[model samples]
Target chain A: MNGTEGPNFYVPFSNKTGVVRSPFEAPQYYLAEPWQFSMLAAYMFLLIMLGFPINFLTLYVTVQHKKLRTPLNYILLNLAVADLFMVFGGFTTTLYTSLHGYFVFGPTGCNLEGFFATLGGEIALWSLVVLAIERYVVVCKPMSNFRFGENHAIMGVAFTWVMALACAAPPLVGWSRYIPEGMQCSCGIDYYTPHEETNNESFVIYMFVVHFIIPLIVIFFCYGQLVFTVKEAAAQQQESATTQKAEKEVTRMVIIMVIAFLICWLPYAGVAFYIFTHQGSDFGPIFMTIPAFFAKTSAVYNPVIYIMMNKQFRNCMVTTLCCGKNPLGDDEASTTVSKTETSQVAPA
Target chain B: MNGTEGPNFYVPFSNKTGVVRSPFEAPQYYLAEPWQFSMLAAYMFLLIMLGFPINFLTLYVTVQHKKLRTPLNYILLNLAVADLFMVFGGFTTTLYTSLHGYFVFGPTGCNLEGFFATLGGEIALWSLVVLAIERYVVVCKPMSNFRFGENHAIMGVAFTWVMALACAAPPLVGWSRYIPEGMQCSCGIDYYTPHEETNNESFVIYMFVVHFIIPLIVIFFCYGQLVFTVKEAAAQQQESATTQKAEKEVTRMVIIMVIAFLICWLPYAGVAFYIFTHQGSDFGPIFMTIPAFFAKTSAVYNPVIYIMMNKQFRNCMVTTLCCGKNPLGDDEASTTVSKTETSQVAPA
Candidate 1:
């Protein structure tokens, strides 16, 4: 029987007959017939045309500039990495599949594509959480010297991917098999089979819990603490004669980072959570499409924010990319160049 | 002919018959039947329930509490007024009519609602902009004695509202009109009316220019200047011993305010602008909804932010609202109070 014949229908190939036939034949309803190739082409053109240059510039500035090598910059660098993966692995693939309404890429390609896309999304969300925490620490516990060092940042980035991989692994490992001739092969909890239903629900819940709810809680708490700390710090500095200058600089950086984190990631998390909770429900295309567009657009916005808001990074970008020189001159050259410098120095 | 029959079909009311009849007979869609009650309920709830407490609290706190009365606080008070009018005069009535898919409200109500709504939105936006500018002045231009005094804040706020009113009036008076017995009483330009299309387009463009594009440009420039000013002030303070403490206090305030402004309003503006440009286009609702929710929620967040984050204010709130005493006591109060009192005494 063909897969679409009934809920429990299955199809098997027979080499001896060199023919395919279903025991219970049913009319085919082309699920992927409606979406136009031109539409997909437009989406692809828009995403790549906008995404690459921005991500590249972010990467370039982060590596090549000295002043841009702060802990926050490290977070931005990781964000760029995740966005880059999405630009190539997810968006491009989505465009192609959207046009064709079938998986042109084979099974292995599907697995790889799904893995990276899932991982990228996971990293983007978690990285934002980490950033909020980092800002909280910097603002609230400035005396603790809880620096978000390269090792810690690297670990956080690595852990994000690891979590993403574990989540994406179910479909690739046979818990959920790919739909043959499906419209698209991408990272999502497969809901094709009855057995996969529980698994899919659990997976969606896990993503919501780990990626959305917990992170949101953490961010709010961190920002709350940050605000408290800032107020306290400002009060103390108001009365104090010394350490005021240093305190002000630290406070400014922390506040800016927190605000930026909220603006960039809050909508993404909110929509993702909504989707996870209401998946498969007939809420119409409007609900699904709006969130997805915002999520996609977020990938493009992160780098632009970094470039526009962060003066140190902005200067470093101009120096590194445009002038091909160190923004901070020789002072920081012997100590350590900024993260912005590393972007231009490193290979993508 | 029902209102929904087509743009070309006009259903006119006859006094002789004391009934309304269509010029051309057409099918009735009854599209507004299901959601009419719910939409009305939601709109009324938002206006009455959400708006009342926010507006009242803002007014009560700013006026009743002596210590809570600052120039910036005055600006906030005015903001609440704008918001209240926006909800009551604009959203509620329009939403009521929208639910029924008919314009129960007359042309006057339509124009008034649109004007108020536009004025409210613009005032809210510009208040933030002004607040940001004020913070910039406080932090960066401290030596210039450019504090947001009562007169200045009041005048600035008045100017913002006037400008908002002026911008809003042009559209209501010129291009747009009440769609009598049409889809809804809400403010939207008539696309089918070819003679009014040019005027409508011009109004939309004008609104976009005044409310968003121009304001955003001004804000960006103002913030940029503020940043440079802050950096310069910090640099100067670092070199000096006498003025460092004051400079630090100023910087802290600026940073907190800037961060707050950005976090609360950026998403609102971003999403609003996107919607303005791409209204009726098939962008996904999921993407739009998150930003929309965030924007709405943001309106309520500022008061919470202030109460929680500002130490002096927080202390005062806890003392006055929670504990029924000024925690700063007579001694600490005497110091700041003397400064104010002496200034007044000298002037008198």
Candidate 2:
């Protein structure tokens, strides 16, 4: 009778002839259906309607504008590439799910879905992680010629996909399966039958540890170290009043990155952990439904986070999104000095 | 009958008088129940057990370590403060709902709950936005003197709370109220209520716009501008080969921050919007459950993000968390030149 008494409890019902009913009865409440299909459809429509044009414009500006082409721009290009993949993959899955609830896509589609999603996601995640680490190295260790090379950037991107694939591949294999149930289907361990007991439980645990826990640990550690390093660097340069401006800029960006990560992922992961442990409970229906939606919704917020908080990105996006209409060009250009100036102008 | 016939639907029950029940004879299934008590208990226990320790550690390290004290650190400190408030206020209310099976704390509690939770969440949200902006500035505008002063950090945090409160307050101040049904209570407008002339649909719309839509837009703008600005700055400094190191560092950090933001919040918000619009439909209960858990779980992941993705933070955390040592000591004592040499000697 307990929550985890998986597939045990049943209720009897009478048809034209009396019949016994299993507790694993058809979901009568219809309370925990996959509504993400409609949500995903709306999200895709919005992305196509809004995000595409904006991102496309961003690509154009960064590529066409000679003044805009910088090492940072290249990084942005990579980011765009990663984001585009996400959009394409996200849209496809959303369409598929909207038409056939859950992950109706066969194993191949599941792998593809998990692959692109994870790849795009990993690139995005590692990009941020790398950026933070780079900032720490630059601000805290400015005299170093430890420049992030094109090779490094390329490698970083490649590495990100590799890790993403590593993280995403298991689900595609027999480690997890996407099964349809009524109006919705999901990619999770096949728990209806307990034949593959050890593999199933281990796979579930592996998914949790690899995807949620490990990543969580990595992000926190990186940001925390960045914070400490920046602080130390600031203190070292405190005597030089001129460097204060550069120090402040670096400090602000790191803080924003940390906060953004927290806002975007913490809640969804928390719920994911709960579902992983409490599968097959009455509450399972609610728990799984909410977190899954949260995971998907997080994608849209990133671009917004980028544009709103950082003045540079704001100006850039505005110009790009608005197609060469520099709304805050004067202010941003005037107020902000390029990184090159600091390297060339300041004595190492 | 149809999904729209929520309030009008009737349930039939057999009477002890050996006859079919009439309209008035049926028990009301919609009456308030107390199933949420256990849920609330679990939520509170989980929040306190996990949130308090992690946040406390972050706060403690930030406050105690002078090396950890920086503008970015201050933002993080404030984030922890906001999250702490959220943990107590939001989690407690959630727990109360779980235990009581309804929002019995009245309008004030509802308002406070919405306000604090949103404020904490917003601060957390915008903090990342700010961090992203900061990263863009640092990487893209390395020479920029846009440092976040303590006052600025304070102001940003204050603004976030103010915005959150502003957005959350209207609902509780008679503009919106929790509609109790069976075993659940919700903070948004009730779908089953009879159509009324004076209903504040505008308020709800405003809530959606201000709290959800506007923030998403802002985040995009900020990140985009940050990326573009960094690119431009990178271009300006491309001639000076020495600046490449700093540029690379900045670019890497920005990428990670953007990715992290995308991963965390996209799905939750997307689903939330769907639930918001589809309230009182058949999908309402399930829809609400999924995104709610996602939102709640987001809090847990912030620390994780910082730890995992950031290299310096990771090393420091591993040293500190595992060995109880100050990882910043050697790095802090070394000059920028020495640090550069060290990197060359031991390139990661």
Candidate 3:
């Protein structure tokens, strides 16, 4: 069965146990069994075990260690919090739904799951955009003395979350509904429903453009200028080997950050669009599950990118895990005037 | 449905969609769904990802880095390989079976799964026993020159695999039979079956003794004597501070290793024993599944134990993950004289 009920579009994601005409004779192996949910369980389990410890520790270390507390670091800290928020608000419930075929939490749960998922996801996407913009500001305007204060940083983080939540809460706008998708063990906009106007399809389209595409535009626009500006500025000044190396590293960091985000989330965005545009076809739940998993993994990937791309973060992560006395053991503490955040502003 | 056919015990783990009378009316929400398999999948996936990378990396670094190649490390390398083998020979197949209700691998598949699981588990268990003995020799006697060579370590590891396989191979002797124990999503010794013979019962008893009892005896006996000898020797000869630190470290490492093994495995042993003695009571599949998962997670846990307990391993892990020049940026290499391996050899 398509798992629809009461003339409502409850298109289930991956469960393909189509109605067995008679249960006494034919043992249908066609039904989605419990073991199929293991990969997803595996995903959420690691997301909690691996994701929580790392993000919380990142937050804790940034908060506790005074020297590490810069405005940009605080912004990154905001990203970590929102990521944690995403996990708490949406991912845990997803874990529960995967265990059962249908929603066990009733009507109130349906609304909450959709809202949390939307809010958390948009916040994550927006945070990435801001980070890209921050990189742009620092790199593209190396000579400019304009700097965001700690208050401004916090305000930006707050605003990013508010904007995401604002866009995500469709319940206020009378699109106060979600239906379970067959493939993803998820509940959200009934992109399945052939509605009168803008319910799931429009909501998702709006969700996609605001949460996904606009962020992309921001990232690309900011990063595009950041790269050329750094390169051209480097040539103009005939910067030192250290300066040149610094520029390349900074540029690569942003590229890696944005690239990693795109690689992980684009499949999800594609699937969302597919749901928006395409209607009924014998699409496997794998189509949605794969992309959803791809998207969900960004919660883990974002922190890793931070650690992998930055020396200080990498050092701190190692130190935290291994109980090292000093975090910057190999790399000098004050090697450059200012690292990625604020230090590289010497102009021609 | 109880998922049965012709007196075969296909009592699945947790799919309890039992129709009281007719499926035409009552669609029960009480069945165990695929989502419960998350824990097992998580265990296996982590085993594959976390276990393989760490163990293989340990294997790689030990083999490639000449400095990391010591006799004790050679033994640890053997341990690493056996652990890797355990993961591959059993876990992937286990993942598949859990997805379905029974051993879909058929008759030959049943025998193969049981044999490999027994082999890998024993190899892991026995490898720890050998490590304890090696540690015992080092800490108890501090003056002589007898040492096991690389060839001996390799032979010992090969011997471990062979012996485990030998013990596990019961099908050849007509003692080998495996049956699906409900809820574990896999098949093994019909601890659930009681028949004309003690095929499953006797095999498990013997497996437990060899895999469980003997290892504990070895660990305790070796570590017990090793601890006493180190304490007395330190008091008698007044060993240097460095010597004292090394001794404490060596003792702690073995203690931690053996303790961690016991903590992970002992519960599973109890469950196995319980299954053997107890028959057809309404024993919850939860009982078996929880322990089995607990047992399965050792595939991940053992490697983590190494990282958490040892400084060198932890540093090497961090360095490997983040491409750094040196792992032991904190502690000096060649720091201690005749560290753990081949130390404390007093002549009779």
Candidate 4:
């Protein structure tokens, strides 16, 4: 068991040392070229540098600004929380391993990285799902008897974590095992394993439907209806004003988040499906690594989309980053606050 | 001349054949790996795809909106024009050549590529300089006698192009020659050539000061004072009922533009300086190519900055991209138009 196999064997197995030794053709699975590893490290370094500060700021500014501490922003705050977790928990480990040209931390580290990566990723994913549902309720079905409040947002946030935990914990509990993923610098669910003994196929299939398909379905349906409602309102706007003012702005913000989320995660999801479909075959090493890198970049994307798409967030970010005067001014009556206040003036 | 030199020699020179053949250690100066070139091509392709449409829409939306037809927006319009030129004129050629893993375009094509690349790049560069000056004048010197008008903007735009043409054309003429730069996939200034007969030394020195230094000085100066004035005004804003409303928004927009410009271009400039300082030394092939790629991405950066930082532009872009209802509504009195109109209410 200790002896190196004849060339071309690439199965990763554990030994007493707790170090997961590379296979004979490690270069094929784990990148061999120093330049390639350097590039990977550089990219992950970028994600950490940008993602950490940005997500932290998102949470900080939301908490710091009393006006931003609203029920609606609670889900966004949770999105930032997940992104920050991935930045520190997932990306930082990947960056270190990439710098070393191999996974420096062994089996336990691999499990930890995988759990956090999956948790952070799926939480952010489901946050978007819940976010879309809220947006749909707020925008498309405003006349409904249902009311959105803090506990409602909290329940949504808590639900996302439960879904994320369910998705992430199975591998640790032996349904599927956490192992070195593409480039062997990061760990994820062992999608490469084809045999039934591991139950990886079931895990992979479950992840595909639950992680990717379900959120996408929920988001598409919610946003699709939201679009129709907004369009109808706008056409009629030649339309008044209900949450119409708040609706469009928040609606626009969510729309961009959905777009950015797809842009970042869809490629990774597509690549995962490709690997599962072609298990045990030599899909190029670089192809898998690039998409994983793109997925991890969702941390950076979420904060930037928030900063760009949401004016209130943008103004807060500008002031915080610049240490300059707040662009929205000294008034605490932000658009969100004012919108809600204005709603009180006329009831359904 | 056609004979291959010994393994180490890497000087690129013309032969009877049109192809600028790679040196013996072609891999050192040219990206030899398939994955590397594929990555380069992918990136360049992204720039072209995004840069073209975004910049086109910037110009299109401005022109289509009658209310947006103002002197202040003229420089931004010109910035978009330069960026669009670069997308078509520079990035497409680079993407094609990157995919081919070498400069497939011959000597004349190389010169043409270099000229257009430099022309488009420097025009965008100088456009910022002039844009800053106008912003400085508009914000800081509101009491000054000078009036910003259509011809003023035209002269500013004209100046940028002249500066750009002056910087770009020097290589095509006798001063320096265009050649396949680092990685040999894209043609640019012959920064590698050290000999005096080529006069590249003079051209390089000229470009270093005129292109990089002068623009840095101007932008820094204009934005520096503008910052102080804004800070003072804000302090006093515990003081304004003037162009103060419009000034801060436009000021914020330009500040972001200047910052983004530096982020995109500074790394490339640093690489150029590194190469010029270490002429004939094996610095690294990938190092050079990456920075050039970063610099070229300035095309994509401009429109995005506009969309993110400027609300008026964002609303217009949303309308165009979605082909949905204009978020800003069908109001003819845009902020700029109304700002000007209001300024007429009380003259200096």
Candidate number with the higher lDDT (2 or 4): 4
Model 4, B1-348: lDDT tens per residue?
A: 422222222233333354434522132222355546656765664465456656787888777654554454787788788877776777766764664555555566567667888898888788888877887787777665887877888897899889999988877667787766557776777666564656879889888888889888998988787776774233222236434754576676777777787887788888888877866565555666778777786776666666655656665555654454544434223442222222232223
Q: What DockQ, between 0 and 1, does each candidate earn?
A: 0.01, 0.01, 0.02, 0.02
Check candidate 4 and list the clashing pairs.
Answer: A236-A239, B236-B239
Candidate 2 chain B lowest-lDDT run of ten: B334-343
Q: Sort every candidate by lDDT, greatest first.
A: 4, 3, 1, 2
Model 4, A204-266: lDDT tens digits are: 888888778877898888767876576522221213663465457666667767777788877
Superposed on the true interface residues, model 3 gives a C-alpha RMSD in angstroms of 12.2
Q: Which has the better lDDT: candidate 1, or candidate 4?
A: 4
lDDT of 3 by residue, B199-259 (tens): 5556666766776787778877886786556643333222666656555555666666667
Judged by TM-score relative to the true structure, which candidate is superior, 2 or 4? 4
Query: What TM-score would chain B receive for each of the candidates shown?
Result: 0.65, 0.67, 0.77, 0.83
What TM-score goes with each of the models? Answer: 0.40, 0.41, 0.49, 0.49
Output the lDDT of residue A272, model 2: 48
> What does candidate 1's lDDT look like per residue over B1-348, in tens digits?
212223422222222443332312211123233323333434343344445554655566555455544556676678777767766666655543433334444456556655676577677667667766666676566556455777777787787888776766665555544232222334433322333443545665666677667766776676676665445344432445434543454445544544655665576556545644653433432333344333443344455445434444444443543333444432223212121221222121
Ten-residue stretch with the least lDDT total in model 1 chain A: A20-29
What lDDT does each candidate get? 0.51, 0.49, 0.58, 0.66
lDDT of 1 at B136: 60
Model 1's TM-score against the true structure: 0.40
Q: Candidate 2: lDDT of A343?
A: 17
